[PDB]
Design a protein around this ligand. Structure first.
Ligand SMILES: CCCCCCCCCCCCCC(=O)CSCCNC(=O)CCNC(=O)[C@H](O)C(C)(C)COP(=O)(O)OP(=O)(O)OC[C@H]1O[C@@H](n2cnc3c(N)ncnc32)[C@H](O)[C@@H]1OP(=O)(O)O
Ligand SMILES: CCCCc1c(C)nc2ccc(OC)cc2c1SCCC#N
Ligand SMILES: [Cl-]
Ligand SMILES: [Mg+2]
Length: 384
């Protein structure tokens, strides 16, 4: 029925727009009209402004998400974003502490809800719009289906609107009104044996355990010999390389130099970026972020370490060679699996590089924006 979503400036289930439509559902919005009062919570609960740069407030967010965030359909896994990753993801340039919103249960003083946004310039079908990118919406498992999520959504919407921002981008594995694109995930096994032991990958009489380990074996030698961790000096070159590349897509972020530095400069166990520098210019880049999952009730293993493909550009190699080196660099860093979405040029490399098609997909959404939907090959942005 989408009783909450149908109240919002988003497309209906049946809405389809021509390619030339590219505009807000509701235009001419005024900051002066925005409600100044916080949305009402049920009795016994209060808004809390989280300070993500405070280790202890950050750890409270970490706990909530560790225990209560997204699980796969089969409840094998729960994502387990680290505390340091949350710091990185939430404190990009011009972030607002007031857009990192908690809800506490008063009697326990415990965080039971969260939602966040950061500001980003988003180009959709050639129009660049100031938007908020929303993530980490989470209600405690003991408090589900009580309509707390719309309260979280309406309150962050209000706080964003106070900044004269009227559009947002967000992604979800669930279907909501109405995706602008949909991309499946694909997985490249690295630690084949672990993936078999936890019930994720499957063997048969043609594919015995030794055969499966050999199938996924990689040569520890880069196609691009000088690929190396990005350093502060590389910022201008990555900004040039990436920013030019992204302009071919129908949906992408428009990064400033400050944004390049924050999003790509490497941080151990969070973000890995490698570059190939020739005569002081950056000609190729690989990047992936770390996102482990908790393995739910497995006797032997508690964590699956996973790298997620981020942005990758090649000018001196084939896209296949570049991604083969991204898998190698992920293996060198102790990742169990390398995950990517069929966005940008990715789908082309998946069969040859031994990726398997996953079980679900990630839907991309705009809030208060009307445009034609598009195939994921035309998506040029990867959210966290
Ligand atoms: C201009 C600024 C604009 C800013 C804001 C833009 C929009 C930002 C939107 C947020 C983007 C976040 C992106 C993001 O974080 C990445 S997607 C991951 C979201 N988090 C999880 O899945 C965590 C595990 N689950 C939970 O914590 C709860 O199940 C949540 C909190 C998901 C729902 O709590 P609950 O206790 O299960 O449910 P009620 O409180 O009873 O509420 C049910 C209503 O919630 C709608 N719902 C369910 N899942 C949703 C989802 N993933 N997006 C949006 N809406 C979602 C649902 O369709 C229904 O409305 P409907 O009746 O119309 O069908
Ligand atoms: C082994 C392939 C990775 C799949 C995976 C893992 C490890 N954890 C998840 C936790 C939550 C969840 O919510 C839908 C999905 C997963 C998945 S599949 C989607 C992410 C990817 N790739
Ligand atoms: Cl309301
Ligand atoms: Mg609820």
């Amino acid at each position: 029925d989408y009783k909450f979503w149908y109240t919002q400036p988003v497309p209906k289930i049946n809405d389809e727009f021509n390619e030339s439509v590219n505009e807000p559902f509701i235009s001419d919005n005024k900051v002066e009209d925005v409600r100044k009062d916080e949305y009402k919570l049920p009795p016994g609960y209060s808004w809390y402004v989280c300070d993500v740069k405070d280790e202890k407030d950050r750890s409270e967010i970490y706990t909530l998400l560790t225990d209560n965030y997204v699980e796969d359909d089969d409840n094998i896994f729960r994502f387990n974003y680290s505390a340091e990753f949350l710091l990185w993801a939430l404190t990009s340039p011009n972030y607002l502490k007031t857009w990192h919103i908690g809800v506490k249960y008063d009697a326990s003083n415990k965080l039971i809800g969260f939602i966040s946004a950061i500001p980003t310039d988003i180009c959709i079908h050639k129009r660049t719009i100031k938007m908020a990118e929303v993530n980490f919406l989470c209600v405690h498992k003991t408090l589900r289906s009580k309509r707390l999520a719309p309260v979280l959504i309406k309150e962050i919407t209000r706080r964003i609107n106070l900044e004269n921002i009227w559009q947002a981008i967000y992604t979800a594995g669930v279907y909501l009104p109405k995706p602008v694109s949909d991309a499946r995930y694909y997985h490249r096994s690295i630690n084949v044996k672990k993936l078999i032991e936890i019930g994720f990958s499957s063997l048969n009489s043609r594919l015995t355990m030794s055969r499966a380990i050999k199938l996924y074996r990689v040569e520890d030698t880069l196609n691009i010999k000088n690929m190396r961790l990005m350093k502060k000096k590389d910022v201008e070159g990555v900004h040039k390389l990436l920013g030019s590349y992204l302009e071919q897509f129908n949906l992408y972020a428009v990064f400033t130099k400050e944004e390049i530095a924050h999003w790509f400069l490497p941080i151990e166990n969070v973000i890995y970026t490698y570059v190939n520098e020739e005569n002081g210019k950056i000609k190729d880049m690989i990047s992936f972020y770390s996102l482990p999952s908790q393995i739910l009730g497995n006797d032997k293993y508690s964590t699956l370490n996973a790298a997620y493909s981020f942005y990758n550009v090649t000018t001196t190699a084939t896209f296949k060679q570049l991604m083969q080196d991204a898998i190698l660099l992920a293996k060198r860093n102790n990742f169990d699996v390398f995950n990517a979405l069929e966005v940008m040029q990715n789908k082309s490399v998946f069969e040859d590089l031994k990726f398997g098609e996953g079980d679900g997909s990630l839907k991309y959404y705009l809030y208060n924006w009307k445009c034609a939907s598009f195939a994921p090959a035309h998506v040029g942005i990867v959210l966290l």
